[PDB]
Structure 1
Amino acid sequence: APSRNGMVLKPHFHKDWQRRVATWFNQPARKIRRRKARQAKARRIAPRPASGPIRPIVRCPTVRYHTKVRAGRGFSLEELRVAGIHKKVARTIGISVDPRRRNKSTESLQANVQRLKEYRSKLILFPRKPSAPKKGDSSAEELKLATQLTGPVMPVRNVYKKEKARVITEEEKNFKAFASLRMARANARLFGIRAKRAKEAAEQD
């Protein structure tokens, strides 16, 4: 059943497979169906934008992916706390809330606190009957457009430092090398043992 040189093959068709198959003869029909549910939804509601709330800025989980920025889930309260808005007020204003999200940095915390007040800067509200509790005049002179698109404040913005040019100094060109890693790794798998060999000198008495 095999012949002259070729791949060895395990094709997974020993199981019954012709009674579960899924031809996508409706994937054009499902694309222009779920465009009607974006046409006749984003006009049906409001001058509120399409594509949902403001999402915060979020840095990725894998070592592979920690260098990059992603539209996360919700500002996890603290960003509602340093910026100072009420949590059940926030999700009717148009601000997403994700309570099980934590903050264990101060660098990333203020990165959304300015973002939230920046959203609150570019927000205009409609008071019901124009007595205006804590909203200004005529509707920002007008609503200027009907709907906004693909995210409020461009949630990617994968910005990068310029770091233009420098003069190599004395300390920078002599030290920071490969041997600073082989001894760095040697204080990762020869550190706990050297805690134990100093216990040998405290029991030598």
Structure 2
Amino acid sequence: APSRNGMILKPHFHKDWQRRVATWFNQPARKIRRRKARQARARRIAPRPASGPLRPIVRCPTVRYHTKVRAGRGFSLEELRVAGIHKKVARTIGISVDPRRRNKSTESLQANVQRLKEYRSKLVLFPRKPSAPKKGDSSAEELKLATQLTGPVMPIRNVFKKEKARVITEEEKNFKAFASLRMARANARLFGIRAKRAKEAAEQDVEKKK
């Protein structure tokens, strides 16, 4: 029974939970295991970034996350095309490619491009044989580094531009933000209705002639 003041509460212990409790005595082991395997992936892919492949800048979705920026799944085809990379080669120089990404905004497009431009620059493409052909980089940048990059390659920092202390013009001052919004909101609400009344008015004027 309840007894004088305190959350009514519905706790979900009606099915056979005890049969299916999950205990985390693993966890430490699992932190270790994963880490070992991690270290072994690095030692496998000797000079390639442990991180993995270069991944692109991307905004998050939804009015919430909106302003923040993440890593993407991979660079979209427009972005390769423009940076001048063949899509089946990108996979082979450490460049994540998703192809399902639309590209709407020209800004993001050029950002990612600037990544790939940046990347190819600071990449140390080894040759096929030790006998050097074109593309594969110089013996200088090879001896001085067969060196990995620990941590995600070209890390995606979400950045701000500082707006200096202005003056506030009298014209800037004058604005009436609170109203302008309330109007705006209303003008969306009503946009459809009005234009039905206008369509009725134009019909009444044409009907007057006939």
**Both structures adopt the same fold (TM-score exceeding 0.5):** yes
Cα offset for 1:144? 4.3
Greater Cα offset, 135-144 or 35-44: 135-144
Distance 1:109 1:7 in 2: 52
Match of 1:67 in 2: 67
Greater Cα offset, 126-135 or 50-59: 126-135
Distance 2:150 2:136 in 1: 28
Q: Structure 2 vs 1, CA of residues 143 and 172 (structure 1 numbering), >3 Å: closer, same or farther?
A: farther
Secondary structure in structure 1 of the residue aligned to 2:170? coil
* CA deviation string 1:24-83 (max 9, x = no partner): 001001110111101112012221111210000000011100001101111111110111
Question: Given that residues 124 and 139 in structure 1 are in contact (C-alpha distance below 8 angstroms), is that contact kept between their aligned partners in structure 2?
Answer: no
Cα offset for 1:3? 0.5
Secondary structure in structure 2 of the residue aligned to 1:188? helix
Question: Given that residues 75 and 97 in structure 2 are in contact (C-alpha distance below 8 angstroms), is that contact kept between their aligned partners in structure 1?
Answer: yes
* CA deviation string 1:62-118 (max 9, x = no partner): 110000110111111111011111000110111111011110010110011111010
Secondary structure in structure 1 of the residue aligned to 2:91? helix
Greater Cα offset, 140-149 or 158-167: 140-149
Question: Given that residues 57 and 155 in structure 1 are in contact (C-alpha distance below 8 angstroms), is that contact kept between their aligned partners in structure 2?
Answer: no
TM-score, normalised relative to structure 1: 0.93
Question: Given that residues 76 and 102 in structure 2 are in contact (C-alpha distance below 8 angstroms), is that contact kept between their aligned partners in structure 1?
Answer: yes
Q: Structure 2 vs 1, CA of residues 181 and 143 (structure 1 numbering), >3 Å: closer, same or farther?
A: farther
Cα offset for 1:134? 2.4
Q: Structure 2 vs 1, CA of residues 201 and 143 (structure 1 numbering), >3 Å: closer, same or farther?
A: farther
Question: Given that residues 126 and 139 in structure 1 are in contact (C-alpha distance below 8 angstroms), is that contact kept between their aligned partners in structure 2?
Answer: no
Cα offset for 1:148? 3.7
Question: Given that residues 58 and 72 in structure 1 are in contact (C-alpha distance below 8 angstroms), is that contact kept between their aligned partners in structure 2?
Answer: yes
RMSD: 1.7
Cα offset for 1:202? 1.2
Greater Cα offset, 41-50 or 17-26: 41-50
Secondary structure in structure 2 of the residue aligned to 1:180? helix
Cα offset for 1:195? 0.4
Structure 2: gaps of 5 or more residues = 206-210
- Give the number of equivalent residue pairs: 205
Structure 1: gaps of 5 or more residues = none
Structure having the larger proportion of residues in helix: 2
Calculate percent identity across the aligned residue pairs.
97
Distance 1:99 1:79 in 2: 10
Question: Given that residues 54 and 94 in structure 1 are in contact (C-alpha distance below 8 angstroms), is that contact kept between their aligned partners in structure 2?
Answer: yes
Greater Cα offset, 78-87 or 151-160: 151-160
Distance 1:89 1:35 in 2: 30
Distance 1:136 1:154 in 2: 21
